[PDB]
Swiss-Prot record:
EC number: 3.4.23.22
Catalytic activity: Hydrolysis of proteins with specificity similar to that of pepsin A, prefers hydrophobic residues at P1 and P1', but does not cleave 14-Ala-|-Leu-15 in the B chain of insulin or Z-Glu-Tyr. Clots milk
Family: Belongs to the peptidase A1 family.
Keywords attached to this entry: Aspartyl protease, Disulfide bond, Hydrolase, Protease, Signal, Zymogen
Organism whose genome encodes this protein: Cryphonectria parasitica (Chestnut blight fungus)
Protein name per the record: Endothiapepsin
Transmembrane segments: none
Active site positions, chain numbering: D35, S199
Annotated S-S bridges: C255-C290
GO BP terms, alphabetized: proteolysis
Lineage: Eukaryota, Fungi, Dikarya, Ascomycota, Pezizomycotina
Domain Peptidase A1: 17-328
GO molecular function: aspartic-type endopeptidase activity
Catalytic EC class: hydrolase
Length: 330
């Protein structure tokens, strides 16, 4: 089997991407944030504290003939940005782009933090990291991908995120028309439960490539590119007037600037992030100070190849017995 679904930016900045997901019988379609940095599929639901729901579409398990309470199971998750959610668990039929899993754990939110409430466009998350990170207790549950894997034509999914435009998540096949050149594959460590890999270095603009190992995660659920302070300083030093602002919470730059590109290494290959991808616009409405798309990972504890980086590539998440990641230009 295979599946193919379009993923769409939630706003004009590409802050996140939503993908329609069918849950239950008859289908209830919710728009979920596919997150290769976590491993829970959770939704706003009829059980979510009413004051914490503001415009989201909810899953109502009582209206699904295939929903079953997973008795005794609870979940609770905290994300890197400080947001969180928790609740109980149903199993139900879940389909993405024509690919159906029966008996998928669907984690129903009883509580969500303010950032989720305030984002009316995101009805929940669909985790695509390794199932060892799943938070369901006392019986850990499998991700949608893990459940689908055996049935897929090939044990892979791909992320093809757009810049200010829709893109695609495919399951079970590699669309050879979706990228240019060849796909370069690189080793993955699953030790921390992430799609963790080591970039071979970077360049700023038309500058020379610096060969240096940068361990990080491929994370579709993180907006920006978070890299070591040394790398980030070297980038922003090429932008007149750019500075790190503790009050704003990162590097900012004059909105009048033209940003240089940023290149990262994948083995001997190179992925170029155009400068415009690094512009996250005014820090506040009407400001002439703009927020940068490359930020320091110092004090996160991990480097994160978030959407800024991934949307410059066609990315293969290979879930074979020995997992790997592939990157192609597009």
């Amino acid at each position: 089997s295979t599946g193919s679904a379009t993923t769409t930016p939630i706003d004009s900045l590409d802050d996140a991407y939503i993908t329609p997901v069918q849950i239950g019988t008859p289908a209830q379609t919710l728009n979920l944030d596919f997150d290769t940095g976590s491993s829970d599929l959770w939704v706003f639901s009829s059980e979510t504290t009413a004051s914490e729901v503001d415009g989201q579409t909810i899953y109502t398990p009582s209206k699904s003939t295939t929903a079953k309470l997973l008795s005794g199971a609870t979940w609770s998750i905290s994300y890197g940005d400080g947001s969180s959610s928790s609740g109980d668990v149903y199993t139900d039929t879940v389909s993405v782009g024509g690919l159906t899993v029966t008996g998928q754990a669907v984690e129903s939110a009883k509580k969500v933090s303010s950032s989720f409430t305030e984002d009316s466009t995101i009805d929940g998350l669909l985790g695509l990291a390794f199932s060892t990170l799943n938070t369901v207790s006392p019986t850990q549950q499998k991700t949608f991908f893990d459940n689908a894997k055996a049935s897929l034509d090939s044990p892979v999914f791909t992320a093809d995120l757009g810049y200010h435009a829709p893109g695609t998540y495919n399951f079970g096949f590699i669309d050879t028309t979706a990228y240019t050149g060849s796909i370069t594959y690189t080793a993955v460590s699953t030790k921390q439960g992430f799609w963790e890999w080591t970039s071979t270095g970077y360049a700023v603009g038309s500058g020379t490539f610096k060969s240096t190992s940068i361990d990080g995660i491929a994370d579709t659920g993180t907006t920006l590119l978070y890299l070591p302070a040394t790398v980030v300083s070297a980038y922003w030093a090429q932008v007149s007037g750019a500075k790190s602002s503790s009050s704003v919470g990162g590097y900012v730059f004059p909105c009048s600037a033209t940003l240089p590109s940023f290149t990262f290494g994948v083995g001997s290959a190179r992925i170029v992030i155009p400068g415009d991808y690094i512009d996250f616009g005014p820090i506040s409405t009407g400001s002439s100070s703009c927020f940068g798309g490359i930020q320091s990972s110092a004090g996160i504890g991990i480097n994160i190849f978030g959407d800024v980086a991934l949307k410059a590539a066609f990315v293969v998440f290979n879930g074979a017995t020995t997992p790997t990641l592939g990157f192609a230009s597009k």
